[PDB]
Symmetry: D2
Subunit: 33 residues, 4 copies
């Protein structure tokens, strides 16, 4: 279903947030070199 | 260099933002099914 | 630990494989428009 | 266009390859801790 477009491309947003968050937590730790 | 940890894991942030935006724009286009 | 660099930047590989697969399966479904 | 699906979701494959490659090159460098 072009809805299951929406759900899959939220699950994009959400894992590509969890990208943002791990790759901040990349920055901070590689702050602590 | 653990600065170049920082920059690479920023370039993490910027692209995994651009993940979020394009996979928003995913949700929007695939809301326009 | 710079082992836990290794594991995290494997968990990089495994998810950015699973990127490739799902964004294949993107191409296949969006070839089935 | 549900083709521009294909092109965008190749550009998925390709940047989420360039994920795979940077996050191998993550592993190797964080091999060299």
């Amino acid at each position: 279903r072009x809805k299951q477009x929406e759900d899959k491309x939220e699950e994009x947003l959400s894992k590509x947030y969890h990208x943002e968050n791990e790759x901040a937590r990349x920055k901070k730790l590689x702050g602590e070199r």
